[PDB]
Amino acid sequence: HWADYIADKIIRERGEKEKYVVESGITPSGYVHVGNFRELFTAYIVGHALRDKGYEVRHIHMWDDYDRFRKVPRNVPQEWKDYLGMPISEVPDPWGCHESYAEHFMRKFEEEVEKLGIEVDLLYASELYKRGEYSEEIRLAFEKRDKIMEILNKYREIAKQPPLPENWWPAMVYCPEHRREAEIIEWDGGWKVKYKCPEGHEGWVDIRSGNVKLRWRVDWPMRWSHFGVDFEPAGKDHLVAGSSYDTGKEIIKEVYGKEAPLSLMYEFVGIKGQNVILLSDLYEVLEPGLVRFIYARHRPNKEIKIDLGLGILNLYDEFEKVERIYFGVEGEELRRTYELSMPKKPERLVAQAPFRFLAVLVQLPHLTEEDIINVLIKQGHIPRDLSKEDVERVKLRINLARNWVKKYAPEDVKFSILEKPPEVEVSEDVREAMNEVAEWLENHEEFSVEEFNNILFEVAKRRGISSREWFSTLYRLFIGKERGPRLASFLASLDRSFVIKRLRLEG
Ligand SMILES: [Zn+2]
Numbered sequence: 001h002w003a004d005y006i007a008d009k010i011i012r013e014r015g016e017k018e019k020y021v022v023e024s025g026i027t028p029s030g031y032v033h034v035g036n037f038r039e040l041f042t043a044y045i046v047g048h049a050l051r052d053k054g055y056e057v058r059h060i061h062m063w064d065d066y067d068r069f070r071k072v073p074r075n076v077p078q079e080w081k082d083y084l085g086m087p088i089s090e091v092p093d094p095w096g097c098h099e100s101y102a103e104h105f106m107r108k109f110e111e112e113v114e115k116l117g118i119e120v121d122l123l124y125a126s127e128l129y130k131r132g133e134y135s136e137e138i139r140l141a142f143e144k145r146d147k148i149m150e151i152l153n154k155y156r157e158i159a160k161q162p163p164l165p166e167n168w169w170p171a172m173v174y175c176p177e178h179r180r181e182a183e184i185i186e187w188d189g190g191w192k193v194k195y196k197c198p199e200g201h202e203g204w205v206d207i208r209s210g211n212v213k214l215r216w217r218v219d220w221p222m223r224w225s226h227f228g229v230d231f232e233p234a235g236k237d238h239l240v241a242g243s244s245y246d247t248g249k250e251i252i253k254e255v256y257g258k259e260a261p262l263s264l265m266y267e268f269v270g271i272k273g274q275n276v277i278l279l280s281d282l283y284e285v286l287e288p289g290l291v292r293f294i295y296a297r298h299r300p301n302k303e304i305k306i307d308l309g310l311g312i313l314n315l316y317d318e319f320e321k322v323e324r325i326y327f328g329v330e331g332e333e334l335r336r337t338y339e340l341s342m343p344k345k346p347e348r349l350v351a352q353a354p355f356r357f358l359a360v361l362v363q364l365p366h367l368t369e370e371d372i373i374n375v376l377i378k379q380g381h382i383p384r385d386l387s388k389e390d391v392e393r394v395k396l397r398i399n400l401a402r403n404w405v406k407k408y409a410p411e412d413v414k415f416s417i418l419e420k421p422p423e424v425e426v427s428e429d430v431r432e433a434m435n436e437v438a439e440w441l442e443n444h445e446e447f448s449v450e451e452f453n454n455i456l457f458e459v460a461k462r463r464g465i466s467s468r469e470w471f472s473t474l475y476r477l478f479i480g481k482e483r484g485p486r487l488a489s490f491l492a493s494l495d496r497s498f499v500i501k502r503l504r505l506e507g
Pocket residue numbers: 093095096097098103104
């Protein structure tokens with residue numbers, strides 16, 4: 001919904017146009033994470049609602065792969081200090097799998113975004129620059145140098161930070177002979193700039209080539225001008241008083257005679273109980289649709305803390321419930337959230353096997369993917385008639401539950417069936433109650449879990465047995481623990497004669 005708002009605020013603020021332009025951008029200096037993805041998603045959701053009003057939109061995702069190589073992350077060979085100063089799109093790939101350093105991190109992210117079904121126009125600074133797509137706007141930068149410096153000192157002073165150095169140029173240079181950054185020394189009134197290469201050297205370079213890059217403060221608003229960016233969310237750090245945005249909101253005006261696009265602050269994203277987290281990490285246990293929904297369910301300035309542990313079970317339940325309400329297959333605002341989280345138009349409900357139950361079924365080794373699917377059918381969680389998408393969705397989720405149990409689930413919920421019963425105190429009352437449950441199971445090949453579960457309380461009530469004594473005993477005889485999986489659906493999933501013989505304390 002907050003995306004529809006900002007949509008109204010965009011049709012209002014900006015004039016009513018034919019096609020709008022939304023933008024997101026990242027520097028591939030390392031692994032683009034779950035926090036960076038929030039920016040692209042925010043641009044996509046607003047762009048999505050914009051189409052929901054009949055307008056047309058272009059979502060530009062800009063890769064600042066032309067930024068210099070400042071620092072060497074962890075896991076990246078230390079022997080790569082030699083490439084600092086070079087643009088990332090020309091720095092080698094530490095692992096060899098790709099052409100550049102920037103490519104390794106860009107490919108991973110673009111692939112992670114596809115599985116989410118989110119479409120965008122990927123642009124590369126390195127290509128736009130080289131092609132001279134920025135020749136003109138770059139010259140203006142030099143033509144309005146004093147103006148730019150004026151603006152940056154205007155804000156630097158509010159924060160009592162010292163003014164820009166006297167011989168400051170709004171752009172840098174990449175030495176053609178060594179490709180490392182270099183301070184610009186001189187300029188004309190058109191093209192050509194002189195630079196003083198680090199160490200010992202001098203030289204001239206033509207702006208019309210691609211070795212004259214606009215420093216970020218100018219480089220951003222120029223970009224908003226070149227393309228017609230109408231909306232572009234950004235990190236808190238760029239929206240702080242005299243930061244990127246405020247300083248660009250002026251440069252684009254006083255230099256490119258344009259109004260800056262509207263913006264929005266998106267907050268932090270992480271996992272509970274907690275070293276970078278990528279979309280790949282969430283994929284190990286979260287369906288792509290779930291990921292999308294999680295980002296559409298929060299307000300931009302409320303941080304997202306995903307519980308990949310025990311709280312993942314209620315996550316799926318709430319998600320499933322909303323999907324059911326959306327298709328009316330179950331008894332208002334969440335409704336539009338479901339639409340906005342989906343890149344494509346909602347087709348129909350797809351078989352939903354309760355995550356918490358797969359976590360249980362997946363811990364019974366004598367069960368194949370087929371067996372699991374069949375259990376789900378008998379206990380009626382998924383229709384008997386499964387489409388292609390349905391079996392495709394249930395199989396993936398089964399794998400997601402198997403992954404969650406191995407790596408994210410707390411130790412408490414792990415269990416294993418005891419092939420033989422343990423020696424445990426069992427009162428005459430419980431004994432007779434288990435005998436009644438076994439008889440009911442022996443005379444009822446078929447039944448619904450819901451009723452089986454009612455029968456389990458009935459027998460306990462008739463004999464006068466508390467919950468802790470009743471359930472902790474059944475859990476102990478079956479899995480050797482005091483607590484365990486929801487009882488009714490658990491027992492129904494096991495070999496029937498195994499449950500009967502165990503209840504009868506004879507096997
Ligand atoms: Zn690579």
